[PDB]
Amino acid sequence: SYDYDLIIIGGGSGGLAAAKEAAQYGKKVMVLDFVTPTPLGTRWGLGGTCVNVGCIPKKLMHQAALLGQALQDSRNYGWKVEETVKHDWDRMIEAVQNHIGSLNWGYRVALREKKVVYENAYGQFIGPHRIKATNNKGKEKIYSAERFLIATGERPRYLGIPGDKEYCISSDDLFSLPYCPGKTLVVGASYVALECAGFLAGIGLDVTVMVRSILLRGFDQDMANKIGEHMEEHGIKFIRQFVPIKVEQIEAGTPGRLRVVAQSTNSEEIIEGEYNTVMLAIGRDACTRKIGLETVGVKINEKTGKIPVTDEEQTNVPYIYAIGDILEDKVELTPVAIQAGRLLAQRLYAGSTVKCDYENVPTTVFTPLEYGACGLSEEKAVEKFGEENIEVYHSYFWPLEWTIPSRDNNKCYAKIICNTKDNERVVGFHVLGPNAGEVTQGFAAALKCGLTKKQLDSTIGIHPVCAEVFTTLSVTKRSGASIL
Amino acid sequence: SYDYDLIIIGGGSGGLAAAKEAAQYGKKVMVLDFVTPTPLGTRWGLGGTCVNVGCIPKKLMHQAALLGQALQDSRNYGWKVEETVKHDWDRMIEAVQNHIGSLNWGYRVALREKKVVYENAYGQFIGPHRIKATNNKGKEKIYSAERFLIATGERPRYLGIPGDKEYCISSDDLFSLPYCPGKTLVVGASYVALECAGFLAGIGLDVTVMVRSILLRGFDQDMANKIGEHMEEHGIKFIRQFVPIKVEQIEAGTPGRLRVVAQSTNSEEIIEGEYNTVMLAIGRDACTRKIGLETVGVKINEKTGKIPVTDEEQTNVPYIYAIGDILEDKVELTPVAIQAGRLLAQRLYAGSTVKCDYENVPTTVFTPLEYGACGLSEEKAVEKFGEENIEVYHSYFWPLEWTIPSRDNNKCYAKIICNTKDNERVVGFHVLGPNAGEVTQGFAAALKCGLTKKQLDSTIGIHPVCAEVFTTLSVTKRSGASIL
Numbered sequence: 030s031y032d033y034d035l036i037i038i039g040g041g042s043g044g045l046a047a048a049k050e051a052a053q054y055g056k057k058v059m060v061l062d063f064v065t066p067t068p069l070g071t072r073w074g075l076g077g078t079c080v081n082v083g084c085i086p087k088k089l090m091h092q093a094a095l096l097g098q099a100l101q102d103s104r105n106y107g108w109k110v111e112e113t114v115k116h117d118w119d120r121m122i123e124a125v126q127n128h129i130g131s132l133n134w135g136y137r138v139a140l141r142e143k144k145v146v147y148e149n150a151y152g153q154f155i156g157p158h159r160i161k162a163t164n165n166k167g168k169e170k171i172y173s174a175e176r177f178l179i180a181t182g183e184r185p186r187y188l189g190i191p192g193d194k195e196y197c198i199s200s201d202d203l204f205s206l207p208y209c210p211g212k213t214l215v216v217g218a219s220y221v222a223l224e225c226a227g228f229l230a231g232i233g234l235d236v237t238v239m240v241r242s243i244l245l246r247g248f249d250q251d252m253a254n255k256i257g258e259h260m261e262e263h264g265i266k267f268i269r270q271f272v273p274i275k276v277e278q279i280e281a282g283t284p285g286r287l288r289v290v291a292q293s294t295n296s297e298e299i300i301e302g303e304y305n306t307v308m309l310a311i312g313r314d315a316c317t318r319k320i321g322l323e324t325v326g327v328k329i330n331e332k333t334g335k336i337p338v339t340d341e342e343q344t345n346v347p348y349i350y351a352i353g354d355i356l357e358d359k360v361e362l363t364p365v366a367i368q369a370g371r372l373l374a375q376r377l378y379a380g381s382t383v384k385c386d387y388e389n390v391p392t393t394v395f396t397p398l399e400y401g402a403c404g405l406s407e408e409k410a411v412e413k414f415g416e417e418n419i420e421v422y423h424s425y426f427w428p429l430e431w432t433i434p435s436r437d438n439n440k441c442y443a444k445i446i447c448n449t450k451d452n453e454r455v456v457g458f459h460v461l462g463p464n465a466g467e468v469t470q471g472f473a474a475a476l477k478c479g480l481t482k483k484q485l486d487s488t489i490g491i492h493p494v495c496a497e498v499f500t501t502l503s504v505t506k507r508s509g510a511s512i513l
Numbered sequence: 514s515y516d517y518d519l520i521i522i523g524g525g526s527g528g529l530a531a532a533k534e535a536a537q538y539g540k541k542v543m544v545l546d547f548v549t550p551t552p553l554g555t556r557w558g559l560g561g562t563c564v565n566v567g568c569i570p571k572k573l574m575h576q577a578a579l580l581g582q583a584l585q586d587s588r589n590y591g592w593k594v595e596e597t598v599k600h601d602w603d604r605m606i607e608a609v610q611n612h613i614g615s616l617n618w619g620y621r622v623a624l625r626e627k628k629v630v631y632e633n634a635y636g637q638f639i640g641p642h643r644i645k646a647t648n649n650k651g652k653e654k655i656y657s658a659e660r661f662l663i664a665t666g667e668r669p670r671y672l673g674i675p676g677d678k679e680y681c682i683s684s685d686d687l688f689s690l691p692y693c694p695g696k697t698l699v700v701g702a703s704y705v706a707l708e709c710a711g712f713l714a715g716i717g718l719d720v721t722v723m724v725r726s727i728l729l730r731g732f733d734q735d736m737a738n739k740i741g742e743h744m745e746e747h748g749i750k751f752i753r754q755f756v757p758i759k760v761e762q763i764e765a766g767t768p769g770r771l772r773v774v775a776q777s778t779n780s781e782e783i784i785e786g787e788y789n790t791v792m793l794a795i796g797r798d799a800c801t802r803k804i805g806l807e808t809v810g811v812k813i814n815e816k817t818g819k820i821p822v823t824d825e826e827q828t829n830v831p832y833i834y835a836i837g838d839i840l841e842d843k844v845e846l847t848p849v850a851i852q853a854g855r856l857l858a859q860r861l862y863a864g865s866t867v868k869c870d871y872e873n874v875p876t877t878v879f880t881p882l883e884y885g886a887c888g889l890s891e892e893k894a895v896e897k898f899g900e901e902n903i904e905v906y907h908s909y910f911w912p913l914e915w916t917i918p919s920r921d922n923n924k925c926y927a928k929i930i931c932n933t934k935d936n937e938r939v940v941g942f943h944v945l946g947p948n949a950g951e952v953t954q955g956f957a958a959a960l961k962c963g964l965t966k967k968q969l970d971s972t973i974g975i976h977p978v979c980a981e982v983f984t985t986l987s988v989t990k991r992s993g994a995s996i997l
């Protein structure tokens with residue numbers, strides 16, 4: 030009947046997870062992946078955003094920055110290290126790219142081994158059950174499938190201003206940049222913006238972040254501001270309430286010199302600054318517009334680009350499914366895309382009825398001082414259950430590892446948000462400190478089990494470990510008592 | 514009626530936690546603490562074992578070792594560091610002792626602020642409600658109290674052999690040692706033994722561990738062996754099935770040279786070795802024998818030295834309570850002592866009925882590769898529920914941070930133990946990897962909430978973080994399938 034049982038459009042986290050699982054049940058599967066280049070020409074291999082141009086390289090460079098601090102710390106612990114150690118950009122990129130290459134290859138082998146056809150072509154619906162794939166050299170091929178999975182992801186957004194596409198870079202370009210960016214302006218206050226600002230600073234570069242309004246929209250703002258205070262105290266410059274209106278090249282190079290003109294958000298005040306590199310981290314746009322969805326009848330939100338979907342990841346067209354960042358009002362993270370792909374395959378081809386649970390999905394922002402969160406922000410808890418029913422227990426802590434280097438006391442911060450109407454249920458968990466993700470993972474699991482403050486209090490701490498602060502939280506915001 | 518409401522004997526974790534909490538309810542409290550010196554003359558200030566001679570200095574030196582690794586790792590991330598960096602023992606100790614001193618002081622002030630009398634004297638019961646306290650210069654004073662709390666801790670045990678007390682050190686001396694130990698023999702396979710062996714090796718010293726039988730008695734033996742394999746692969750020498758029968762001084766010094774004669778455990782074979790320093794980490798003895806318990810009627814286990822106690826920490830004498838490592842068949846960790854002390858004070862003086870929950874208390878062994886555990890060992894699970902009802906999910910993992918340095922793949926290991934007769938309840942949690950304690954803490958809370966495998970599988974991972982390996986465990990030991 031059809032060429033394939035399933036055709037997956039997009040070879041990112043979600044698509045590949047779906048492919049691997051579907052093939053496990055003997056189904057004929059094809060993955061189409063194609064990385065349309067950056068304005069400046071940057072391309073990469075199989076695996077999608079996370080592998081090539083997201084989580085993996087980002088965390089690796091965050092580690093380069095952390096190791097910078099390790100070198101400093103080591104002195105007081107007795108290691109005889111030269112007072113200032115210099116860092117080499119090109120060496121770091123070679124090592125990162127080398128790793129990304131092995132993952133690119135890893136996936137290509139993985140799909141071959143599981144009998145999944147991988148086609149490096151750009152997919153585009155032409156009609157019911159039919160898709161056209163255009164390869165790099167321009168050749169077209171038409172394929173049919175019983176079902177389709179849109180796993181097409183997003184790409185970085187540009188400001189609609191002169192000079193942006195020609196002289197600025199995005200996260201897409203940064204992680205393979207063939208030269209050290211030098212003095213950098215990061216435009217935006219998304220997690221990607223602050224993560225990159227942070228590690229570029231940790232490697233010793235002069236970094237400025239230009240923000241429109243608030244830091245980390247979507248996240249608990251009390252933590253957001255704490256992250257910002259920390260970055261500002263550790264070198265990073267902030268320009269608040271400004272957006273660039275023009276970027277112009279003073280001199281080309283590697284890096285060259287650029288002038289950025291920015292306008293105030295609440296007045297006609299204009300400022301100028303010159304930078305070596307200008308990074309645009311102001312959000313991402315869904316890749317749902319240029320894939321022929323009209324030819325097949327799939328409905329999307331025309332304003333936001335996102336695809337509405339059932340709690341089973343089904344679009345309005347029964348045989349077409351969508352997963353990943355593309356989805357309307359879900360969670361835009363790699364492991365969510367993976368779980369969604371795995372579970373869809375099992376529902377479709379293995380008789381399972383288990384759905385992807387998008388509630389209380391944990392995250393971590395890898396800022397210089399890491400931020401891990403799970404559940405409701407304080408604001409959202411108050412909105413949902415009422416100020417009077419929310420008790421917020423909090424405390425500062427000082428990692429033992431920081432005492433000998435003698436730095437950053439009363440900076441790491443722990444808070445939980447509890448619902449008094451529901452047995453002091455822990456509806457929100459937030460930590461600012463080292464290894465925030467390692468700390469947050471298990472408390473994410475405790476939320477799935479309906480963790481209560483009585484239960485958390487009864488759990489014994491591990492000593493001396495940062496996470497133990499959560500075992501003995503006794504001071505509430507409402508009490509007004511000090512936590513220094 | 515009595516001089517004090519409460520007299521606490523011993524100013525360790527537990528005692529001080531009890532004192533601080535009791536004083537908060539306006540009760541008249543005295544703490545007696547006295548550190549009887551090491552055979553070699555080592556003494557220290559207030560705070561007990563943890564603060565002076567346990568978790569705090571131990572983790573700090575563990576960090577000195579970890580930072581050694583960080584210096585090596587940093588090269589491939591692009592930092593231009595000299596190929597071998599040397600380490601200075603004396604500077605490390607100065608920094609550690611400096612921190613311990615601030616904690617010593619911290620407590621001294623804390624007790625002053627909360628109106629708690631601190632007496633640096635050795636406590637000893639003389640009769641009902643009465644105790645004699647002998648200070649350093651030898652002067653005695655008699656005090657009475659309505660109740661008493663024995664929080665007397667333990668001290669390192671020696672082998673009954675010639676030369677042990679005169680020439681060998683214990684954990685007590687190691688953390689203030691005024692010279693670099695040089696070539697070291699660690700005798701024992703307790704967590705203290707392996708932790709110290711590990712960090713002494715991590716600072717570049719030549720370390721040998723001499724073991725009687727198994728590593729880490731009490732802990733999951735599969736994990737124990739993996740920790741040993743890792744230590745052996747990273748420099749540490751192991752002599753198995755030997756115990757020292759004699760230690761003699763070849764030459765005195767700082768360090769000197771010592772000859773250790775050891776005998777096989779299953780034969781008459783004898784081996785000799787020379788070391789600069791010999792550390793005895795073969796366990797600890799309760800300080801319950803020389804404190805006058807006979808004069809007051811408190812029953813102890815005469816074989817083991819431990820004090821039997823109710824689930825409310827009450828001894829057979831109603832007005833006398835005990836907490837901490839001293840207790841019979843409980844859990845010998847700082848945070849357990851603290852929780853027990855806090856909760857006892859609250860039961861006694863604030864109308865609480867909450868008891869200390871000694872079930873599924875988490876621990877972390879700070880070996881070069883860290884081991885975090887909560888709940889049942891695999892062996893103990895099988896013994897309790899039966900082999901056929903236990904499913905063990907496991908996986909290796911590779912910290913992203915180690916990929917660029919290009920080291921130690923298939924070494925970190927995660928397993929959970931599930932009870933099939935009880936909804937695949939996670940009755941055991943085990944992780945071997947970096948920041949094990951940070952990873953384990955929240956899963957400990959999950960176990961308090963009765964975490965289930967269905968629930969764990971429904972929790973989404975944080976990417977790329979080590980802990981996320983627990984989100985997707987699908988391979989069982991019973992299946993026989995490979996996990997490389």
Ligand SMILES: Cc1cc2nc3c(=O)[nH]c(=O)nc-3n(C[C@H](O)[C@H](O)[C@H](O)COP(=O)(O)OP(=O)(O)OC[C@H]3O[C@@H](n4cnc5c(N)ncnc54)[C@H](O)[C@@H]3O)c2cc1C
Nearest residue numbers: 039041042043063077078079083152181182353354362363
């Ligand atoms: C800087 C940065 C940091 C991040 N950090 C984290 C983090 O720390 N933790 C975390 O969990 N997530 C992180 N992410 C988010 C994560 O990258 C995404 O959520 C994840 O990649 C989503 O998977 P996906 O399959 O939906 O999309 P993608 O992985 O991006 O896959 C989409 C793929 O499909 C291809 N494609 C698009 N259209 C077509 C077409 N028409 N035909 C064929 N192929 C097509 C694209 O080229 C792309 O390769 C980060 C992202 C960025 C940018």
Ligand SMILES: Cc1cc2nc3c(=O)[nH]c(=O)nc-3n(C[C@H](O)[C@H](O)[C@H](O)COP(=O)(O)OP(=O)(O)OC[C@H]3O[C@@H](n4cnc5c(N)ncnc54)[C@H](O)[C@@H]3O)c2cc1C
Nearest residue numbers: 523524525527546547561562563567636666837838846847
């Ligand atoms: C090498 C080592 C590593 C350790 N690592 C960890 C770890 O990583 N995590 C963890 O949780 N625990 C660790 N511990 C164990 C932890 O330190 C103990 O569980 C904790 O100190 C228990 O405190 P306690 O209140 O029972 O007694 P202690 O802390 O030992 O205090 C007893 C105090 O009372 C004094 N005393 C004794 N007799 C008298 C008397 N007659 N009169 C007055 N004072 C007296 C003692 O001198 C001492 O100061 C470690 C211990 C060691 C030895």
